[PDB]
Amino acid sequence: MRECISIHVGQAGVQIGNACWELYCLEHGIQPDGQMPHHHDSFNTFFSETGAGKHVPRAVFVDLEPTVIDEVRTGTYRQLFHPEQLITGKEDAANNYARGHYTIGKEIIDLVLDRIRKLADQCTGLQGFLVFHSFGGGTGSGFTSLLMERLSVDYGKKSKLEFSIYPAPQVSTAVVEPYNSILTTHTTLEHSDCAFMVDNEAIYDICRRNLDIERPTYTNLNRLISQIVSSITASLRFDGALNVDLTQFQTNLVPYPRIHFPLATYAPVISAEKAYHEQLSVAEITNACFEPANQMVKCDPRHGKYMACCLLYRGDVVPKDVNAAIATIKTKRSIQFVDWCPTGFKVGINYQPPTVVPGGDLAKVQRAVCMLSNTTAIAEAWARLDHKFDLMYAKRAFVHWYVGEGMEEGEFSEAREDMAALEKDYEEVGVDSVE
Amino acid sequence: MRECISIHVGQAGVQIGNACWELYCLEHGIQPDGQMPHHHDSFNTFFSETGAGKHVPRAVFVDLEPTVIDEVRTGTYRQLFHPEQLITGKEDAANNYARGHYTIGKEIIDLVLDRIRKLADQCTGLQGFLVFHSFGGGTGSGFTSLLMERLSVDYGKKSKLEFSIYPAPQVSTAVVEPYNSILTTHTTLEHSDCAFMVDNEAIYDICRRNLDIERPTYTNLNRLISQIVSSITASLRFDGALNVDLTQFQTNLVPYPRIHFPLATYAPVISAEKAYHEQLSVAEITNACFEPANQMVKCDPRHGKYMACCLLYRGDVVPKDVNAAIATIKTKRSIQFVDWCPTGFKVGINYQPPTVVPGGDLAKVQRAVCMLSNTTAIAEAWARLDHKFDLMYAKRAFVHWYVGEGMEEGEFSEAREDMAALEKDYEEVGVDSVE
Amino acid sequence: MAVNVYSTSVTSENLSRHDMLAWVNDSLHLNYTKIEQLCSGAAYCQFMDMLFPGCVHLRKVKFQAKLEHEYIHNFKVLQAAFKKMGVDKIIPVEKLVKGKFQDNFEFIQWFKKFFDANYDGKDYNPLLARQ
Amino acid sequence: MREIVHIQAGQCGNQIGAKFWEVISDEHGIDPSGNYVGDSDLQLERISVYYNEASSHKYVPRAILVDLEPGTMDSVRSGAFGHLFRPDNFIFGQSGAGNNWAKGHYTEGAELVDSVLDVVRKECENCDCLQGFQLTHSLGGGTGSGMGTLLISKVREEYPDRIMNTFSVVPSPKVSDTVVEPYNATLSIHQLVENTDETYCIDNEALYDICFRTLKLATPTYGDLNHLVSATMSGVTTSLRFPGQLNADLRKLAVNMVPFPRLHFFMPGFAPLTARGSQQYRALTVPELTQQMFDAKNMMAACDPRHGRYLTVATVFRGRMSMKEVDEQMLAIQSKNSSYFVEWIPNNVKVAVCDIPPRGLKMSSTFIGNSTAIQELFKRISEQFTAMFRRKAFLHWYTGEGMDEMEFTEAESNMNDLVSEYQQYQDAT
Amino acid sequence: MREIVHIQAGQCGNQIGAKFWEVISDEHGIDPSGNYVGDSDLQLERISVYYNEASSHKYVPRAILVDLEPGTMDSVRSGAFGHLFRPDNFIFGQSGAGNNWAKGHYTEGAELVDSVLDVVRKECENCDCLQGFQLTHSLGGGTGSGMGTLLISKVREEYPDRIMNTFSVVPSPKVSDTVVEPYNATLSIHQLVENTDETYCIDNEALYDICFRTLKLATPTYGDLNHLVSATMSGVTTSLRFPGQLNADLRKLAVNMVPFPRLHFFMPGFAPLTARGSQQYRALTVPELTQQMFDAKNMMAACDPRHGRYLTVATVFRGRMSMKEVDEQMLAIQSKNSSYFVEWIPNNVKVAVCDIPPRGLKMSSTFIGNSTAIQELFKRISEQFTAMFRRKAFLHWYTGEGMDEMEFTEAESNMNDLVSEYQQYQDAT
Ligand SMILES: Nc1nc2c(ncn2[C@@H]2O[C@H](COP(=O)(O)OP(=O)(O)OP(=O)(O)O)[C@@H](O)[C@H]2O)c(=O)[nH]1
Ligand SMILES: Nc1nc2c(ncn2[C@@H]2O[C@H](COP(=O)(O)OP(=O)(O)OP(=O)(O)O)[C@@H](O)[C@H]2O)c(=O)[nH]1
Ligand SMILES: Nc1nc2c(ncn2[C@@H]2O[C@H](COP(=O)(O)OP(=O)(O)OP(=O)(O)O)[C@@H](O)[C@H]2O)c(=O)[nH]1
Ligand SMILES: Nc1nc2c(ncn2[C@@H]2O[C@H](COP(=O)(O)OP(=O)(O)OP(=O)(O)O)[C@@H](O)[C@H]2O)c(=O)[nH]1
Ligand SMILES: [Mg+2]
């Protein structure tokens, strides 16, 4: 009865969406061909049910390079997706924000908007959009900015959550990452209700340490991110002792218009062998999810002060021990809140234990926790990205490409000043003041 | 309801711990895999019962060389221990105190403390730590001095019992034993509540004479030492007519803060064939345990005076003959007490007869005694060790290894005078005083 | 930076319960009658201010705390003061707040040793500092 | 989709091109007769990028071979693997350019270029969505350079919004194959810089050293020499031909590798390179591929990077791998070798991974590096050209075939100008 | 874990090394082809310490064989057990050093070390956690002592916090294999003392005495001698390769055996040593193993300990044995033989026990003793060098390759200084 739609942009978005939709089909008991052998409706929130028993997802896969979309088309999930939904271009943006936002991206935006509009008018209780995109990728960044602008123009006030991929401090795959990230942050700072932030290096370290895999290809990272997304959406999809919604997340996590960059964490992430020798109590899973090294963004919250926290437990969970563990955590020494947030925890409980994908690295668990923390430690990441951008731009590198694809240096200057203002606001709000 | 954790450091600790934890599983009826076929609980003081019927011990095996820990991993007790608990380094300390305390140990100390805090916070009524470390080794001495400094800061006032291995007078496996032993005692003197002293040379004679075994490998010695450890904590796990606790040991054996070096003793120790021709009464095993040749440290108590004792019976023991037997022991002219200790006996009776490990040398016995005599005769052991250290240090032999690994020549002098302070402290209070 | 000190078992250095209360009362000029009344942490926060000028915003703490929730906020300020000076003694805040003799006596026993180590002999009037 | 047009000029281009289409056909499983005989359907998913569909499942390639003498053309037609090229594309002249600039760019090349442009235009219109051009030539000869430059200028006018690559062969430092090398090279590079996107400069004797020592070959013939160039010349393209976990194409590489319009001269590389005997004692794994790739010894250009600094570097991995180590070791490589890396370009490494290993190999890689060390390569060539031109030698017929001494003034000035900026950015802070 | 890099120089190092890797392969059950054929899984638990895992479960040794002439390399490659070494490690020159210091350290050795160092570094990078190096050479020859010393200095500059052992073959007193022996020996020891960790001097005729008398062999070829040496050089490192009741490693031995930085010259020993005929009349037991070790007759160095005192003594047992007799009898040995033991080092015995017996024996042992009788070896060598240098004989051959007479002043002065400290500590109270 409540429907939210998801837009996956770029190769990273498409791969993450493939993993996430595999997880959803496993969770709701839908066969890959679309048929099927708390639960009754549930699948109505994601899977639109057609005349026959077939269910089709509410997804819009959009890309400019056709390789990954063709791979998905010929993949095992071929009969599921609506063939008109998969929108592909002809040439990629080539890590060029100008190409993906001005030159090329303007030739497919109308078709993408038409498909979005048809899907929205199909539903009757539309709740929000979930945008899966990266930051370094040219098409991801450019088309994300274009879609934010167009969707904000079309639908006035709706929840628009994003699941980005912040560039790692040391690990790097591209070279124009600072330009792309600065530009995209300046453009879509205004048109986003709440953006969840994920980094690849931290997930690498988590998979290496906690799960103990020495061969962690991109599939494992995609599975972890998909698990986090499903844990976020489980409150809408399933009944529970205390339900939360997208508007609840947004309201409880964003205190100021500019400060809407929380970071996510999942627990427990343990292998099969280590599962038997562990008792998996609510208190210890809270402690593990709140431990500094388990955070999925490469930054230590100890360096800053927490601003808001959202805990979501799912499974055989008792609110009494939940509240006892949260009180203990608040009493603990590492967690230090800001002076103007006397209450700093929003708690949700769900009655559906998490499901395990087959062949996956994680083990079956009867209790799961997803933690969304809005804090100050992200200021160091913003400052590092700003420093990289300034160092690269001091002598006008690649600016010839960017300008040749229909841009001007005035845009770079405005993005730089906007990022500086955002960092200053973040630090000033985080720091204490007298009276 | 009562929990105590054990830390095994070095090869000596791990090898002893491998034999000791074999005994506890036998006593509580725990299969090596973890399942199971006075008892209602009992095993909760040592075995943390997990979600399934499996029980996992509360042990932390730490070593720098991976040679011996890997043997435990592949050994018959492979499924019992928690895989994360077994902590290993990369290279050993090589009989160097400086390497295992300054250079190499410091890089792994943080990881060990992480697992200690995780196990301590899981439990609720923690009493104290049992430390099984040697004295001559590098990681068994340098590293174990690091754990005491770290543990004492984190937990202020808790019991800390050391089951050390004193270097033998004539038998000597290593050559820098005086350098390591002198340095360790000066550092861990201020952070140990009660340290039990056990010497390898004295146990060889006990196994050769009483047990009548001419092939006493290190496996046989560790079984005999393990029975002492079990009797110390036998009161926590089992009921009795007169119980003792971990704190009661600490308050009854240490007249002065520096003088906390008792020596253990076990009785009866007889073979299988000699058992039938012995009636094994309470009035004689008390006599047997007091014989000068049965003491587990190579030093005759006849040369000194007893300061305090502690008996611990178990089995078909009736308190009337216990008190009658001790009265006859007191009036014997071989046992002489100090003047300022008119009362010099602490008793404790348990209802659990000691069990026997299959293939062991000891026979089934319905009565047992564990004696912890804090006597002045141990002052001879300090004097002998101080003689060796002063002999080699005069010409500065072997020092260039210690100095070059993060130590100073000045540090040796401070540890030398400290042992001189303890040596005359031990004598000046065991000797009589005027008035 | 501040120097640290441990406390496990010391002779002729631990003080009597009566004398410990006199030292707290004399240093701050107040009328604590029981040592277990030190659950508030107001005196504890004042001790850090005396040891190191600044390092603690004395305006944040309040000395009229009488509730279970009010007791915790006073200790959270002391938690930040410990971190800023780089001390590494974990306060068992879950156990002091209950106001029992056991845990409250052990913490002040440790704090007395910390007080002597980082005292330069300076003096002032806490009355104007408190008001 | 994103078809690539291949143009081969000169004897080197034809000999390299003839060996090149051997590898591509093997990769896609195309019989020399021209019919598909492969097994996996992934090869036929993207076959239009290089090959062209025809009646009865014929797959004639999108190649254009042009030369001024029939000696090279007759060899590829009569020899093996010559039954699949389309005879229409076999454009050849009558007499060779004679190792002359003007005879290859003005006089003899004038009539041939008009015929070629009609074939190129016909191929382009048959294309669905053009991606770019690929040209293989030599910078020392007349036919390879005289018209290859002429072709570059004419094609650039027709399709300004396209990306084309020139896999030239830089003249050898030690022994010169042709006597008048500097006149042909200097007059050529001044033309390439103006209207080309990225050039993969390779060297002859730099391949001699690689094959003799690393590959352990006693008698390196041109068949084994051109085989090495083919592998590195097909690795850069294979990212878009096959599905991968992090795709790339011609345009994606150019954006990262070319910070400034003038600075687009690269140095290729390949790995692994092992002899027939010594392949049984090496564990084929990522840690050893990166070490073999980054050492100055295994470099296909007569330039040692230790005298220069890597401006930007891209590695195009192949085969199946776990990308924890793919990006873990490049961080380690960057930190340890931070001395030879520019400071005002942070994290200057681009990495792409495919999913189809090359034939007979579990995993491989291709390394393209835009380095400052090329500065000395143009300095040496300009040094030879200046000495020869001062005495006014060998140009009594360069001027006699249309050109003039006025033309040389800009060519030398442009070359010296380019090396000034190339050196200046190395020392810039 | 704790991998060991093995380096062999000179003809003796290759001949000793050839017999050494025969024993290790037998111990770990490695077929000559290079594939595991063993039975017990305990051998493969620690196989990376010496061997290196490659593709298809093939194991290759971590050895680097280097020599100035192709005579030795050709024999080991063509002969049996030559199919497992990596051909890259087979580094060799073209002309021998000619039994000259300078020709092996300055002139001919300069070219080889640059190539060898790159192979060492490549091997060390492949290592997980390096433990140390092992070098087997000769102190009398040219390349074995010339380049071996150069290798020691270069490696020491790159890995300072590592422990490496040199198993040199000390020159023999009565019979001299090369005429100019003292010049090479004295000029080498002055370098080893500076930058080596721990060295076992092994004599030649002392092996003849052991083989002829104890083993009762009429015609001991070099195969029988090298077999005897290999057992000692395998018993030292067998503690960290196999599980044991009381483990030890390379570092543990160095701490106990080396009281002072300059006093790190040892004398090895092995037991039991019995002929084929007389093995059936003796029962293998600990009482006789220890007796066979401490007697001056069974020693690998031609220096009788009765003329000196044991500073410190190690003993690395093997096989299965009761720990009581291990400690019971060493005390009995110490008390009865207390005359030849230093007084200011009490309890100067170090003992380690393993749990895997050597091939074809129930139990064995290895005795390493840092004694004072080594003094008499250096006194003889210095005496010969001083007399020869006074007449300025053969010196005009060393000066022609870089060296000078000034360099010799410290070499002899250092040797005389070292023997002064060695004497002074024996009589010190
Ligand atoms: N977490 C995660 N990140 C990915 C994955 N695949 C790609 N990425 C990220 O995507 C970035 C590359 O840019 P993309 O967003 O993929 O751009 P593109 O889809 O190739 O299209 P262009 O920008 O035109 O090249 C890399 O920096 C990666 O961090 C993935 O499977 N999982
Ligand atoms: N009782 C008993 N003592 C042992 C046993 N194994 C070793 N030891 C003692 O341990 C000493 C050897 O040094 P360790 O403490 O083991 O040092 P380590 O654990 O090997 O670590 P490193 O010093 O770095 O080599 C010997 O002197 C023995 O007294 C054993 O099985 N039982
Ligand atoms: N890689 C490679 N390069 C070659 C080969 N053969 C020749 N070359 C190079 O290519 C150049 C050949 O000259 P071209 O440009 O082809 O000129 P041409 O074909 O002889 O015609 P004219 O210029 O008129 O003489 C020589 O300078 C060589 O350096 C080859 O087999 N492989
Ligand atoms: N243990 C042992 N020693 C040997 C054997 N063969 C030779 N030696 C010793 O090693 C020395 C050989 O000289 P090397 O150092 O190898 O010199 P080289 O390899 O001949 O090269 P040049 O010094 O240039 O002549 C001789 O002096 C012998 O004393 C052997 O088979 N076993
Ligand atoms: Mg892309």
Ligand SMILES: [Mg+2]
């Ligand atoms: Mg050890």
Ligand SMILES: [Mg+2]
């Ligand atoms: Mg030609």
Ligand SMILES: [Mg+2]
């Ligand atoms: Mg020779």
